[PDB]
Amino acid sequence: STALDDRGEVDIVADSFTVSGVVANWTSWSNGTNVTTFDGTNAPNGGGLDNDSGKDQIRWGQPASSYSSGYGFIDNDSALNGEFALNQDIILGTFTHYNYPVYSGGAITSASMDVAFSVTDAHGVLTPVTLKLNFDHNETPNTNNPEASKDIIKVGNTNVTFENAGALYTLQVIGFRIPGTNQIVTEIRTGENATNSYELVVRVGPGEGYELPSTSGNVLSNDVSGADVDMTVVGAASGNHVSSGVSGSVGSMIAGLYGNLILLADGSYTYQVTANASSIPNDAIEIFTYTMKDGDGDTSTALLSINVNRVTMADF
Amino acid sequence: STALDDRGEVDIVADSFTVSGVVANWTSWSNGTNVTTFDGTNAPNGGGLDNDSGKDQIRWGQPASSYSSGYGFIDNDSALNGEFALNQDIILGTFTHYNYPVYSGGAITSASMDVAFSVVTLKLNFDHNETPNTNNPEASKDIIKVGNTNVTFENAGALYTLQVIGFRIPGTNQIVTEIRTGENATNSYELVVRVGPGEGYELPSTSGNVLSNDVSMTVVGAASGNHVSSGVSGSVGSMIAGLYGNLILLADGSYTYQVTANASSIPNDAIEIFTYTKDGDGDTSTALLSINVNRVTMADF
Amino acid sequence: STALDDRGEVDIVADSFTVSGVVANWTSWSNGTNVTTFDGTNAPNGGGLDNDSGKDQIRWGQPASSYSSGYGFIDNDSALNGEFALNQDIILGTFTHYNYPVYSGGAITSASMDVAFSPVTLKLNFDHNETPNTNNPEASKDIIKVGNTNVTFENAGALYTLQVIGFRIPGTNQIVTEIRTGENATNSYELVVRVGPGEGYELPSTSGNVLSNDVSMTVVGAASGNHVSSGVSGSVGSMIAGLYGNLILLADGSYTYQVTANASSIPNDAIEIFTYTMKDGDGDTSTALLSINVNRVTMAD
Amino acid sequence: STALDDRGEVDIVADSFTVSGVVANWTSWSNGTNVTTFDGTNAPNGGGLDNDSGKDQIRWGQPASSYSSGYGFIDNDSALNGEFALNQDIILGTFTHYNYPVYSGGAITSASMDVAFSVTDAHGVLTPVTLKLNFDHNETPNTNNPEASKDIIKVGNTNVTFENAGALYTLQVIGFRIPGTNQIVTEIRTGENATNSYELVVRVGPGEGYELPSTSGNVLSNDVSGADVDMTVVGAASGNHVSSGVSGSVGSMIAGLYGNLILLADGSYTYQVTANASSIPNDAIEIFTYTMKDGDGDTSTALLSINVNRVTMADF
Amino acid sequence: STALDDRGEVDIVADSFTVSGVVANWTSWSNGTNVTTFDGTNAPNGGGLDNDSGKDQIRWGQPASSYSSGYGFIDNDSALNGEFALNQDIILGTFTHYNYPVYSGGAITSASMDVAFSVLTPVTLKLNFDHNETPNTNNPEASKDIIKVGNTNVTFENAGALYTLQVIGFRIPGTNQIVTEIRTGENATNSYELVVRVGPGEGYELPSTSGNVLSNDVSDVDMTVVGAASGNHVSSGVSGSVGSMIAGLYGNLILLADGSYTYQVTANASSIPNDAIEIFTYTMKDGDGDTSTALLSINVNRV
Amino acid sequence: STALDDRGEVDIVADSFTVSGVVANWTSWSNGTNVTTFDGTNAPNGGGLDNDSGKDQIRWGQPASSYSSGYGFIDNDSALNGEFALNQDIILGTFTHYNYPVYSGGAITSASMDVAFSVLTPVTLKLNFDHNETPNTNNPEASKDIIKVGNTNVTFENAGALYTLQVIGFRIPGTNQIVTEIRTGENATNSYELVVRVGPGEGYELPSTSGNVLSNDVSDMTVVGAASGNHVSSGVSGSVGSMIAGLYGNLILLADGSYTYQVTANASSIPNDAIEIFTYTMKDGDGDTSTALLSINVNRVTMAD
Amino acid sequence: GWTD
Amino acid sequence: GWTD
Amino acid sequence: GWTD
Amino acid sequence: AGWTD
Amino acid sequence: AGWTD
Amino acid sequence: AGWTD
Ligand SMILES: [Ca+2]
Ligand SMILES: [Ca+2]
Ligand SMILES: [Ca+2]
Ligand SMILES: [Ca+2]
Ligand SMILES: [Ca+2]
Ligand SMILES: [Ca+2]
Ligand SMILES: [Ca+2]
Ligand SMILES: [Ca+2]
Ligand SMILES: [Ca+2]
Ligand SMILES: [Ca+2]
Ligand SMILES: [Ca+2]
Ligand SMILES: [Ca+2]
Ligand SMILES: [Ca+2]
Ligand SMILES: [Ca+2]
Ligand SMILES: [Ca+2]
Ligand SMILES: [Ca+2]
Ligand SMILES: [Ca+2]
Ligand SMILES: [Ca+2]
Ligand SMILES: [Ca+2]
Ligand SMILES: [Ca+2]
Ligand SMILES: [Ca+2]
Ligand SMILES: [Ca+2]
Ligand SMILES: [Ca+2]
Ligand SMILES: [Ca+2]
Ligand SMILES: [Ca+2]
Ligand SMILES: [Ca+2]
Ligand SMILES: [Ca+2]
Ligand SMILES: [Ca+2]
Ligand SMILES: [Ca+2]
Ligand SMILES: [Ca+2]
Ligand SMILES: [Ca+2]
Ligand SMILES: [Ca+2]
Ligand SMILES: [Ca+2]
Ligand SMILES: [Ca+2]
Ligand SMILES: [Ca+2]
Ligand SMILES: [Ca+2]
Incomplete structure (x- = not known):
């Protein structure tokens, strides 16, 4: 696995x-x-x-x-x-x-x-x-x-x-x-x-309400286990901790550089950008580590890398 | 100007x-x-x-x-x-x-x-x-x-x-x-x-800019009614009560007018009149903002 | 009537x-x-x-x-x-x-x-x-x-x-x-x-008018269950509890019924029965039933 | 006799x-x-x-x-x-x-x-x-x-x-x-x-059940015969029929004005008031006739007169 | 016991x-x-x-x-x-x-x-x-x-x-x-x-008597009736019929597991001689599981 | 009144x-x-x-x-x-x-x-x-x-x-x-x-008590309303002579103030300090109305008591 | 011509 | 469609 | 072959 | 005490 | 008595 | 010791 x-x-x-x-x-x-x-x-x-x-x-x-x-x-x-x-x-x-x-x-x-x-818009139109x-x-x-x-x-x-x-x-x-x-x-x-x-x-x-930018996914989706083993996230952390692997913080708010991660035991996650845009460089990447455990009890660790992309109103 | x-x-x-x-x-x-x-x-x-x-x-x-x-x-x-x-x-x-x-x-x-x-x-x-x-x-x-x-x-x-x-x-x-x-x-x-x-209740309203058609600019005065003889000073960005509602007019000419009056209080041919008064030279000029308040039916909306 | x-x-x-x-x-x-x-x-x-x-x-x-x-x-x-x-x-x-x-x-x-x-x-x-x-x-x-x-x-x-x-x-x-x-x-x-x-949570509900198919009218009585023998008096415009939910029926026949019960409490072939009494201009009264089928559906619809 | x-x-x-x-x-x-x-x-x-x-x-x-x-x-x-x-x-x-x-x-x-x-109860309180x-x-x-x-x-x-x-x-x-x-x-x-x-x-x-008013007696008790000539009732009827004497109805229900008589062959009787009290005057008397026969076969007739007395609850 | x-x-x-x-x-x-x-x-x-x-x-x-x-x-x-x-x-x-x-x-x-x-009372x-x-x-x-x-x-x-x-x-x-x-x-x-x-009396009732057969039995105490029958069956002992109606010569017995019984005379008085006695047998069991049998002899007295 | x-x-x-x-x-x-x-x-x-x-x-x-x-x-x-x-x-x-x-x-x-x-007694x-x-x-x-x-x-x-x-x-x-x-x-x-x-006792009977609520009223007087619970703010109309369900039993109250209350509840359902509360409204000859409460203790007692 |  |  |  | 609101 | 808020 | 909420 x-x-x-x-x-x-x-x-x-x-x-x-x-x-x-x-x-x-x-x-x-x-x-x-x-x-x-x-x-x-x-x-x-x-x-x-x-x-x-x-x-x-x-x-x-x-x-x-x-x-x-x-x-x-x-x-x-x-x-x-x-x-x-x-x-x-x-x-x-x-x-x-x-x-x-x-x-x-x-x-x-x-x-x-x-x-x-x-x-004012680009054409000089004023909107009260x-x-x-x-x-x-x-x-x-x-x-x-x-x-x-x-x-x-x-x-x-x-x-x-x-x-x-x-x-x-x-x-x-x-x-x-x-x-x-x-x-x-x-x-x-x-x-x-x-x-x-x-x-x-x-x-x-x-948009029609204000919402922090966010993205969601599942980290177990691409992971590998025998057709007869279930996989479970047992650890998560900010940064790269692959050498050690990680334990705990599954379902906790995990602070990164630009925002927060929550990753659940079934691999589903949401990442939310809380940082001021001014604090976010070009080529900004947010890195997390997670450790998975399979039905055999075997563990494996990998990275979740999320590109924070600065864009314009015109290109949105 | x-x-x-x-x-x-x-x-x-x-x-x-x-x-x-x-x-x-x-x-x-x-x-x-x-x-x-x-x-x-x-x-x-x-x-x-x-x-x-x-x-x-x-x-x-x-x-x-x-x-x-x-x-x-x-x-x-x-x-x-x-x-x-x-x-x-x-x-x-x-x-x-x-x-x-x-x-x-x-x-x-x-x-x-x-x-x-x-x-x-x-x-x-x-x-x-x-x-x-x-x-x-x-x-x-x-x-x-x-x-x-x-x-x-x-x-x-x-x-x-x-x-x-x-x-x-x-x-x-x-x-x-x-x-x-x-x-x-x-x-x-x-x-x-x-x-x-509509889907929420909102007082009827209209918006505009009074400097758009002016000739040369900054709004330096506003008031209810017709005060062109004197010109006007102050109240830029204040709520200005008229007969049927309120005006706010900002220094860059942008305004919103909002009808607060009960419809029953609004006659036919109802008009709301305001006065406003400066260019880069420091020269002043005064004019009027005239707003029709039109009674309409649900059908005509 | x-x-x-x-x-x-x-x-x-x-x-x-x-x-x-x-x-x-x-x-x-x-x-x-x-x-x-x-x-x-x-x-x-x-x-x-x-x-x-x-x-x-x-x-x-x-x-x-x-x-x-x-x-x-x-x-x-x-x-x-x-x-x-x-x-x-x-x-x-x-x-x-x-x-x-x-x-x-x-x-x-x-x-x-x-x-x-x-998520x-x-x-x-x-x-x-x-x-x-x-x-x-x-x-x-x-x-x-x-x-x-x-x-x-x-x-x-x-x-x-x-x-x-x-x-x-x-x-x-x-x-x-x-x-x-x-x-x-x-x-x-x-x-x-x-x-x-849907986009907010809302109890399931249905609305109607019971006088619409009546022959001649003011609703003067309403109640849960079948009370046709006796007829009914009062509770027009009150919340009337049934088995699965609540009825409000107004004097002009308009009603809303709202399912409050947990779905688990609602059998197949569930029917909610109410009685109402109507009075006409002559002062003559007549009683009938309002029968509302509460149908368990699936997300599939 | x-x-x-x-x-x-x-x-x-x-x-x-x-x-x-x-x-x-x-x-x-x-x-x-x-x-x-x-x-x-x-x-x-x-x-x-x-x-x-x-x-x-x-x-x-x-x-x-x-x-x-x-x-x-x-x-x-x-x-x-x-x-x-x-x-x-x-x-x-x-x-x-x-x-x-x-x-x-x-x-x-x-x-x-x-x-x-x-x-009204024992203390005069209206109770149910x-x-x-x-x-x-x-x-x-x-x-x-x-x-x-x-x-x-x-x-x-x-x-x-x-x-x-x-x-x-x-x-x-x-x-x-x-x-x-x-x-x-x-x-x-x-x-x-x-x-x-x-x-x-x-x-x-x-009383503790409802019972029609009633009285009992024996009409032969005061009748006259020789020591060894037993007496037997052989007739009974409502009203006064002494001239004629009476035959039959011994042990039948005999309707009077206010109630019913049953008189048996050995002289024992019960009289029961069935009439509504409203139908019973003051000085009300119920009259019956009976005929007796002795061992010799000789008959004699007399009257049984039962006073029906209206009384209050004060009188018990 | x-x-x-x-x-x-x-x-x-x-x-x-x-x-x-x-x-x-x-x-x-x-x-x-x-x-x-x-x-x-x-x-x-x-x-x-x-x-x-x-x-x-x-x-x-x-x-x-x-x-x-x-x-x-x-x-x-x-x-x-x-x-x-x-x-x-x-x-x-x-x-x-x-x-x-x-x-x-x-x-x-x-x-x-x-x-x-x-x-003469009517x-x-x-x-x-x-x-x-x-x-x-x-x-x-x-x-x-x-x-x-x-x-x-x-x-x-x-x-x-x-x-x-x-x-x-x-x-x-x-x-x-x-x-x-x-x-x-x-x-x-x-x-x-x-x-x-x-x-x-004020209603008709069959003559009857009640008692408990365990009251005088010896055994701490843990006694239970496990059998009952009409007649004398002491040699064999009895098993079953606890709480059933048991027909005797003159009437019926019911005897419960705790020793309580009722006996009711159903016979016509004409069928009941002088010196009439009704005999039953019961078997008791104690907590040890030991059994013992005895008789319940109920006199039926004509008065 | x-x-x-x-x-x-x-x-x-x-x-x-x-x-x-x-x-x-x-x-x-x-x-x-x-x-x-x-x-x-x-x-x-x-x-x-x-x-x-x-x-x-x-x-x-x-x-x-x-x-x-x-x-x-x-x-x-x-x-x-x-x-x-x-x-x-x-x-x-x-x-x-x-x-x-x-x-x-x-x-x-x-x-x-x-x-x-x-x-032991069978x-x-x-x-x-x-x-x-x-x-x-x-x-x-x-x-x-x-x-x-x-x-x-x-x-x-x-x-x-x-x-x-x-x-x-x-x-x-x-x-x-x-x-x-x-x-x-x-x-x-x-x-x-x-x-x-x-x-x-010699037959089974639900526990019960009787009284009259008008007896202590101040003034002709007639009960014109009754209900379970406390409804004094509003007063009450109707249900005179109907069976009125309370927590532990039923009330019937007649127009002349006479009432009977009967405990139907299982004893197990009746707490200590149990009280049953009703409201009634009275009307006098003038047509004036007044409302009050009928409060009944439901007391658990032993056979010895 | 029903009978009981 | 029996009735009582 | 009536039944009750 | 019998405080009130 | 000079209650303040 | 002191004021408590
Ligand atoms: Ca993965
Ligand atoms: Ca937790
Ligand atoms: Ca925990
Ligand atoms: Ca959990
Ligand atoms: Ca202008
Ligand atoms: Ca200022
Ligand atoms: Ca200011
Ligand atoms: Ca400003
Ligand atoms: Ca209808
Ligand atoms: Ca109302
Ligand atoms: Ca009202
Ligand atoms: Ca209204
Ligand atoms: Ca005589
Ligand atoms: Ca015969
Ligand atoms: Ca014959
Ligand atoms: Ca005979
Ligand atoms: Ca014994
Ligand atoms: Ca059995
Ligand atoms: Ca059995
Ligand atoms: Ca049993
Ligand atoms: Ca009172
Ligand atoms: Ca009635
Ligand atoms: Ca009535
Ligand atoms: Ca009546
Ligand atoms: Ca026949
Ligand atoms: Ca037949
Ligand atoms: Ca029928
Ligand atoms: Ca029939
Ligand atoms: Ca059958
Ligand atoms: Ca059958
Ligand atoms: Ca208050
Ligand atoms: Ca207060
Ligand atoms: Ca303050
Ligand atoms: Ca303060
Ligand atoms: Ca606190
Ligand atoms: Ca506090």
């Missing part, structure tokens, strides 16, 4: 749209007293400045100690330099949670913000696109326990599909990130009398 | 379906004690009457002081007079939150109500938070969250969607998607829905 | 899919301290054993009294014996909520688990509320919310959807979508899913 | 209970297909209306021609006006047999109906009494012979004992009666595609 | 009442046409003669071929000679079923006869009959008509104590079999003795 | 007797040809086996096609494990009807079987059967043979108090319906569970 080398390939669109500056507007909220929305200012609790007249700030509550609570979203227009890259984390802006003590009952329970922008974001808000009753007193925001994983040069793209909310970290969260917790700023991360790719 | 007037148009289906009386049934809930559902009665906590045998009331909890908490939905069949108008706020009924103090742990966490009718079933979902009661009465309020669910159905070969908008205090204009109700209190709200063509 | 007998038919796919053992992995979470994921062990708080190396356990918090809180999902591979039946409740596994007292602030707010099998992956989502603990033990319970997620996949050229139904106490019939668990306790629930044809 | 007049007396309780409306429920049955139990309606085969929500109708079988067979019991609450009289025929209701042709095998073999009603009725049913296979094809019902002579003001009483089923007739039957025969309605007759009286 | 002889006793009242001639009257019936009742006559279908004026005959139906169907009851006054013996089969009379073909639908479904007699026994005049076909067994008699009774007082007279059933004369239903062919008559018994 | 909650209670004896294996004997029958009785065997038509020598089988008729018709009763000694529970359905055994075609006229019309056991329950071997025709439903079992009983003494064992009837295994007559096709057998119950 002998395990043979397997080969696969996955395409990742690596490309960019030309886009305008983005404009954020708080459009709707439920409940709350003294709710205001506005374009950010350098007033103490004004949220800071942005290049537009959209109302990027929202506030609520009668203050019990100083300022009103609320949210603010400062766009990333400068650094985005007029471009959205595909299959690439995009910092749309920085979302700040302003949590202050307000008299109880005075806060919203939910709210929604529009982010609008135009998209609006992404809607939704937030559930829990201004918690304040007690002597400061962790329990934190206020909690929940961001929905909303998206928008739009057309460009005759094909569909989807922009999709991923979540919130502490700058300089890699963890995305979908809920934020903020202490009273504090602010909390997070990058708001989105991605855009082809 | 010269700004040139711009024209656009947007169609709004203005029409109606013939429909039956609607029938509401609480079909499912999660958690809770002493949970009952029933057709409303004039018992004290019975919810009031409706013209059908659907179970429009739900209750839960062991009462600590008087009554059980729950929800009730009294349909608006009488005033709807057998009709759903398109792109028009519809009061499907009145939703009442009965919040009473019940022994802790006794309340549901969620529930679903069906609303059926002939032209179809709309499913509504509710998350429920019966909050632990303390000396702080605002913290002690119980909270309801309604989902923005919908149903698509066919009529004369085309798709329509009925969509939940949310809750409204009667005689007000604000829609909310969560309700907060004090203990030993009831809270009644209109439940607002809309129906229109 | 005379009510005539009606006949309907609803088809329920009754077949099975050959599937691998399933493998669960906790893939993502938000917030929390000391979060770990792992393949279950027979350590005290290790969750128990499963036949795979997927990380079926998640734990969090700095314990204040003994153990960390978390979740665990033990698959049902043994009893599922390599098969998913269509339109049949499937116990995918047993989900346990481990709620212990952890120092405040230390728990996740949400998390997501993948369940893979042959199809169902994603499950959970909102978590580790509530601040007080002297009120019901208020101190921690709450889990599971989403009704699904996955569509292809087989022999046609689409199937697997869909999360919710949580069930074993040996009971109630599905919930939220769990409440006391502090220093565990809570285990069957996780129930269903799979059927 | 000389026959001497004889006397006797018998008490009949004549009195009434206050009672509620009665409520009938079919509680159980054996065999049958499509068996339903429901409150009566004015549907064609619905049985008619009654003032309560008890299930007074039962039906069975798949109809072969129109309707299902069954039974229905419409109470007599209106005319009973809240009262049960003692030792008095009571029409509890009207029982109808609905016999239709049903596909063979589809009918019950038996069934039971409860009839419940309130009567329940009479259980039992029916054997024979839905006969239908042929060209219509008499053989009739379906047959048998009702049991069941009863219930209950307490009132410290003294027990027993309501008892007598049977079925064609209205306006006097014959009670315990079985009914009904043609196919027909209905048959009958009064259901019950009686209530004191 | 050793089985020890067991003794028991049972009393059977052996005695008689003085009674009058009995008088039968058909008092009630349900359904039927041309229903008549009467004192029997020597007319062809008149039932024969009896010493009284009670109506001992009943008839029904429109004859299709000759006579009407019905029932008749001729008392046994002559041979009873003024006496009812206790715990003794009594032929109260002879019941005849007259089954003739009558036009369909014409027969009763049920009927009731009184039998009155002095003991007593009345009520008898009940269900009647099935079956539709006649080419199958003569299916066409037979069927009578069912109830096992009714009457309790009455004598010298301050209660006696019950009880219907046992019907018997073909010169046979030992009692039945409670009769089947009679069309155009035929069927005569049966009507058998009753009277004894002390 | 105001309806006031009402309380009640009912005791159900929950307890068991120690009993021997039971022994069945066919003792008597009327009519029939070639009638035999015997202890069951594994012969084809022998009825199967039981642990005793009682004659549990009876047969009759000249066979026209194969076997003789008859009855057989296989006791349930193994599973009963030496115990009779009170107010609890007891499967005494399995009764099988063997219906074969026999030459016409050859079948019994009736028969009786004794079932004896010790409690006890004997007598069972009675009416039999109708119907003439066979082309109509197979009409040709079925019919059995009727009587609802007989026996009272016996234990530790100075009376108990009654009572026949309930026949049941298809795994179903809940009791019947008192069986119909069996020709050339077929039909097996059922013979269900009995035992409880205190």
